[PDB]
Design a protein around this ligand. Structure first.
Ligand SMILES: Cc1cc2nc3c(=O)[nH]c(=O)nc-3n(C[C@H](O)[C@H](O)[C@H](O)COP(=O)(O)OP(=O)(O)OC[C@H]3O[C@@H](n4cnc5c(N)ncnc54)[C@H](O)[C@@H]3O)c2cc1C
Ligand SMILES: Cc1cc2nc3c(=O)[nH]c(=O)nc-3n(C[C@H](O)[C@H](O)[C@H](O)COP(=O)(O)OP(=O)(O)OC[C@H]3O[C@@H](n4cnc5c(N)ncnc54)[C@H](O)[C@@H]3O)c2cc1C
Ligand SMILES: Cc1ncc(Cn2c(C)c(CCOP(=O)(O)OP(=O)(O)O)sc2=O)c(N)n1
Ligand SMILES: Cc1ncc(Cn2c(C)c(CCOP(=O)(O)OP(=O)(O)O)sc2=O)c(N)n1
Ligand SMILES: Cc1ncc(Cn2c(C)c(CCOP(=O)(O)OP(=O)(O)O)sc2=O)c(N)n1
Ligand SMILES: COC(=O)c1csc(C)c1S(=O)(=O)NC(=O)n1nc(OC)n(C)c1=O
Ligand SMILES: COC(=O)c1csc(C)c1S(=O)(=O)NC(=O)n1nc(OC)n(C)c1=O
Ligand SMILES: [K+]
Ligand SMILES: [Mg+2]
Ligand SMILES: [Mg+2]
Ligand SMILES: [Mg+2]
Lengths: 582, 582, 287
């Protein structure tokens, strides 16, 4: 039973109605940056004793924090911004959430209704701007629509394929007095009629049949499995089918496990891509056959009968055409298949040990590798040490680039929602704010932002947020003084011709620039720099053991290349295994 | 005669064609941040010896810099970004340029043509997203359309009412080899047929007639007059009509002049708003009757015959209905009227000395004012000292808020394009990057960013850009530890109830947080902090005399309110002249 | 050509749509509002200051009345053939200018506007901006329902009329006294006219009759009416025209009068599209 701060017959501002609507959705935390068109909402927030605001220093920091909050918890992330420049600053985060299917509700203040379309002060047609980069959006045109729309927004954001929903609220609506009706019915008849039914037995039996008839099966798991770790683990025990994961699905199956092929794709392991290449049965659970993974589609799993289970019908048959498909929750499909695989367990004689042996040979001949030069610090080694010292239980957010790939390759995530990273849009500056959101959602957890010097400085202002909110966010800054990923492509495809990839100061090219330590000191955040590999272990330990926020500046040689690499649009035969920029 | 780096019969990459197209437009400087979808363009830039790139640390920094470049020169500003997260990071700047009518060409890399619409890696439908916040945009679908589209984009951005134009270029187009045709004809038959003709004599004679029949005329000038300072000055000499300027029109008429009523509007001077209120003839040249200026439209210039000259027909009669109008270049209209006003100079007996005396009485009774408390530093006084020490010849960019209004009130701009400020959208974080663009465009000029601690930290990463590019950007940071403008509205309309407006650290509320000096030190930028009013003059002098970049942290009491103030939607009778938050 | 239009005039524009004020022609004085209210206000002033003002544009009116004598609306009469202009002029006389007139689109539409003197507004129903054929007959239906006691006449062309000929059924079933004055030139006249002046009279699918019997009137519109139980007749000689129209009016209920016209007629005068007043065509047809 919900308790309101207002009487059932007591008229209150629309802004107060909007906040209570959030309270009735179980919202405990918002990321809101005040402005003229949203002042009323911010006032209403202070009257709430159950909702806490985390003030960012930039709205992009706000929305990225909401994403980190969502990704690390499974709850919807909520961010609030003012009209105009506030709203437009959310855009990268909205697109980010849509591409990675992250549940998000974004609320923006708007100019009064009568002022709309007149090019008014701080006015932006944000609904028009964001229609193609949100799952859905709204323009509230009456105070009485607030309870319904808020309920619909949370429902749409969290159900089916999750995604961002934006609600635009005109200032006069916020100021209007009304008595809300919470027993309103949602107006989503089309969306609800197309909601996937629970998986039928006939479809599930067909899959189990294909498994018993295969000899080289491979699991291909992604973001859709983040809530099915238990079910998937049970499935693997009953089948013994090796698991390859996408960038978005890391941790769904334990990375330190024997049957883990780790990540597949452009920078996936040789043995993961091998498995898919030579498979005769491909179990695609919660994936979307993106080109980072497939490369040339005609060569991708060319020998396999393909099973695709997705909650979005639009994804089934989009790029790769499956032989067998199921449109529904992969969690329910796994449960159903587990029931059958156990009751008919000995009737079936599942044993892909010969196939697993073949893959384990590839794992020995072509494992993940890095080279150590003198006392210089290998970024791969740095991440591997972090894994050991945190016992693989840390929440890891990243920026985008080389360090991102290494963070995915050399850390073994035990559970889902430990790995927070921008995959589809691949937005730099994501790491630090996402870590903020994750730490708020998980106060007792070890939270580490593995960032690059390019990505880190993009939203460096959120260091202030971290200190003020007293969040124990650790920053593992891998500093190669470059935009590494772009620099790598220059080396392989443009004869190493540098085109604005150096981030330091050409007047003092051997000096580290900027001095990230002083960025931290500005925000009262303790920090240090390590350069010698011998001192690295103790330095990371110090970062972890020191209570509160910490910045560790890890200096790396920039000549390092992410390996292995399948060129864009290429095949497994085109995989690059050796070489750098020396 | 233009000289190409390629033979007329030599096939070259589309990216090389795009860069030469910029060269043929006279482009000398771009603000580009590299990414996968735009690597080809960046490669092509290095082969150019006439175009220089300024690498920002954030694309929003890039686009804001392009704006500052444009506003301070009258040339189009050019920014380049990669696909996806690069493109979306431009959005605030695009909206900003559209609302303030700033000439801008934005180029974004895009995924290959065949990949469009497939939710590909780093793909954003940026044309769809930005259609409502640009003057026009393009999606290049063939390499042979590049010369035409680039030419059209620059033409559209700089002609008529200036504005931002975005050109989206797919990666495969950049890589395709072709022989460009530069003699292509632009496909803009509609736009060109609606281009305003030069002002007719009959229209101009009607205005001059109204002037001779008036007794209380007032000039109402704005952004449209930025290229007519000479013509406008000549006009004033011949008429003796007092001048009121918008936030966007500052400097069109010299602020230190006797006939200057300074700024009108919400935070305009009492005597400027008085003049308009009691005028019988309102000469609206290059303005758009925004609500910051007019307040309640029915009360705005209720006794005046209104003359409106605008190059955009859609602006004439939008909010306020004029008696006489001219659709065309205000520069040409001024020239025509000057010719008549001089030939019929003694036939006309223009003498509004009685009206000017009435206004000068209001100027004595209600001048701009500030109070000095002990040794604390008045922000108004700080800006006034900067004016004296730079002799009013400095280029001034600002953030958004209280400091912005004070920068407009207490600095007397002699010429147009000294004043760079986000007016229509009012985007924070604009100041520092805009100063960067201005300094690149004007290497020998004194460039000063008058910023607030909220706005400054939003794009603080561009401090790195400043040092690396060795730009003599001065930062006058007015630090009140708050979001001042919002805090002011809290005091007057919400009983001073603080809702997330404090920017410091509540654990050490008397300590200045963050330490902006260390932000500068991180980027090797010399800096200092002043707290006592007695030391202020010497501190600013040091900032100016010190060669290169400099940050001056000016500590101000936060209780200050911007005055005077006409409440939103109010009239002249509702003007607030006294009070703060003490 | 906008640059030539009223090039010597100070322009006053009163419109209730602000988007229309300054769109094509830039006014010196404008009022955004109801023209009805503007007229009322100006009338009050023009009467109170009536003798203070000495308004007398008799010299200007004399100059125009000279042009009216030298260049009036005209048509030519060939033998016993029926001039469509004359047909409409006779309808005006016999209905005393009090009839509601709907039209199709084309030559007959222009003649209906030129040679009928409408006394009051909302007598004239015609598609102007879009200019949609097949408008006449259904519009007459709507007008007759709204104005049961009024004389309603659809002045239509054989191309426009047949486009929605099915509404003849509607007319009979609803027992509406809709009169149809069908001006039949066996062609798409307006298009045919442009062919004559701009394409050397090269016919491109403008003939509406049957090429196997090109002198026979096709289709037989009388039988269209008979199908829907609507009394009808056809007139060909100018001498019988007056009595035929009278019969149409005096006959209670719906009626179709098929008026046969020579197709060589051109709508005059004509200013070519995008032209000026100096480019006005005053003479010529397709003979
Ligand atoms: C520099 C860089 C390099 C990259 N290289 C790689 C790489 O080498 N390898 C790699 O894998 N990725 C790589 N990516 C990431 C890549 O772009 C995509 O983000 C990722 O591959 C797609 O993840 P996904 O296939 O698991 O589908 P997701 O984007 O995670 O979407 C989840 C899918 O499952 C469905 N789904 C959601 N919930 C359910 C449910 N309950 N039941 C059933 N279905 C559900 C959804 O409809 C959707 O189709 C890289 C990114 C960057 C920035
Ligand atoms: C916190 C804050 C407070 C503000 N308060 C105020 C205030 O108190 N007073 C104030 O004035 N502003 C204030 N503003 C700014 C305000 O929102 C607008 O930016 C500004 O008032 C509009 O400028 P403008 O009227 O000159 O037209 P502009 O936005 O500058 O546009 C120029 C106009 O002239 C036309 N034009 C352009 N070129 C030509 C040409 N060659 N010939 C003829 N016409 C041309 C254009 O079509 C356009 O209509 C404030 C902004 C902020 C952020
Ligand atoms: C906002 C933005 N701009 C540009 C890019 C393109 N981009 C860029 C410029 C990368 C290099 C990132 O540099 P870094 O220092 O943050 O990390 P690494 O040096 O490890 O690559 S990665 C990449 O794909 C992007 N993903 N996001
Ligand atoms: C990106 C963004 N967010 C929010 C606002 C709304 N806003 C805010 C939050 C202002 C206060 C700015 O604080 P400041 O420190 O930069 O300057 P002052 O303290 O002098 O006001 S001003 C204003 O209109 C805005 N204009 N732009
Ligand atoms: C539905 C439609 N199609 C085509 C046209 C173009 N059009 C055509 C084909 C006209 C000739 C109409 O023939 P008509 O018999 O109805 O009238 P006239 O012979 O008097 O011109 S008039 C004209 O502008 C149109 N206006 N409407
Ligand atoms: C924020 O912009 C708006 O909401 C706005 C656009 S038009 C219009 C009448 C309004 S408002 O309702 O009357 N609030 C307002 O002007 N302001 N102006 C401010 O600072 C100048 N603030 C803080 C407002 O709320
Ligand atoms: C940048 O994104 C794209 O341009 C892109 C989307 S789909 C597709 C086939 C391409 S690309 O032409 O083949 N370049 C590319 O993949 N990448 N990938 C990169 O890093 C992973 N870089 C730097 C690219 O250019
Ligand atoms: K930033
Ligand atoms: Mg780097
Ligand atoms: Mg401040
Ligand atoms: Mg005809």
């Amino acid at each position: 039973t919900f308790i309101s701060r207002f009487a059932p017959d007591q008229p209150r501002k629309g802004a107060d109605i909007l906040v209570e609507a959030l309270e009735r959705q179980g919202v405990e935390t918002v990321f809101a940056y005040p402005g003229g068109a949203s002042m009323e909402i911010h006032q209403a927030l202070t009257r709430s004793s159950s909702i806490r605001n985390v003030l960012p220093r930039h709205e992009q920091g706000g929305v990225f924090a909401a994403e980190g909050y969502a990704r690390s918890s499974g709850k919807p992330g909520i961010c609030i911004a003012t009209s105009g420049p506030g709203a437009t600053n959310l855009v990268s985060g909205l697109a980010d959430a849509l591409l990675d299917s992250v549940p998000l509700v974004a609320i923006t203040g708007q100019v009064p209704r009568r002022m709309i379309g007149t090019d008014a002060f701080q006015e932006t047609p944000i609904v028009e701007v964001t229609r193609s980069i949100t799952k859905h959006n709204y323009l509230v045109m009456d105070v009485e629509d607030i309870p319904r729309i808020i309920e619909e927004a949370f429902f749409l954001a969290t159900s089916g394929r999750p995604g961002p929903v934006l609600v635009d609220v005109p200032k006069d609506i916020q100021q209007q007095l009304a008595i809300p009706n919470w027993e309103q019915a949602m107006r989503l008849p089309g969306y609800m009629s197309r909601m996937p039914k629970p998986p039928e037995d006939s479809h599930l039996e067909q899959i189990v049949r294909l498994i018993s008839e295969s000899k080289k099966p491979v699991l291909y798991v992604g973001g859709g499995c983040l809530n099915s770790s238990d079910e998937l683990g049970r499935f693997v025990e009953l089948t013994g089918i090796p698991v390859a994961s996408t960038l978005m699905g890391l941790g769904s199956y334990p990375c330190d496990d024997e049957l883990s092929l780790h990540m597949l794709g452009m920078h996936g392991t040789v043995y993961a891509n091998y498995a898919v290449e030579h498979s005769d049965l491909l179990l695609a659970f919660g994936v979307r056959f993106d080109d980072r993974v497939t490369g040339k589609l005609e060569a991708f799993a060319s020998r396999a009968k393909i099973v695709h289970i997705d909650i979005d019908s639009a994804e089934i048959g989009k790029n790769k055409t499956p032989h067998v498909s199921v449109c529904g929750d992969v969690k329910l499909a796994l449960q159903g298949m587990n029931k059958v695989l156990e009751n008919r367990a000995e009737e079936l004689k599942l044993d892909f040990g010969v196939w697993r042996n073949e893959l384990n040979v590839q794992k020995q001949k072509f494992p993940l590798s890095f080279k150590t030069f003198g006392e210089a610090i290998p970024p791969q080694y740095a991440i591997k040490v972090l894994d050991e010292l945190t016992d693989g239980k840390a929440i890891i957010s990243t920026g985008v680039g080389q360090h991102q790939m290494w963070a995915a390759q050399f850390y073994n995530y035990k559970k889902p929602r430990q790995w927070l990273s921008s995959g589809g849009l691949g937005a730099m500056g994501f790491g630090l704010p996402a870590a903020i959101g994750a730490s708020v959602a998980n106060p007792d957890a070890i939270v580490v932002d593995i960032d690059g010097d390019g990505s880190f400085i993009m939203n460096v202002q959120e260091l202030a947020t971290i200190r003020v909110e007293n969040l124990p966010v650790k920053v593992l800054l891998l500093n190669n003084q470059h935009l590494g990923m772009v620099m790598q492509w220059e080396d392989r495809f443009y004869k190493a011709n540098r085109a604005h990839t150096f981030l330091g100061d050409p007047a003092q090219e051997d000096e580290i620039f900027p001095n990230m330590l002083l960025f931290a000191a500005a925000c009262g955040i303790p920090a240090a720099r390590v350069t010698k590999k011998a001192d690295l272990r103790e330095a990371i330990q110090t970062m972890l053991d020191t209570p509160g926020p910490y910045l560790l500046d890890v200096i790396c040689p920039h000549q390092e290349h992410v390996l292995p690499m399948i060129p864009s649009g290429g095949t497994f035969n085109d995989v690059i295994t050796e070489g750098d920029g020396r």
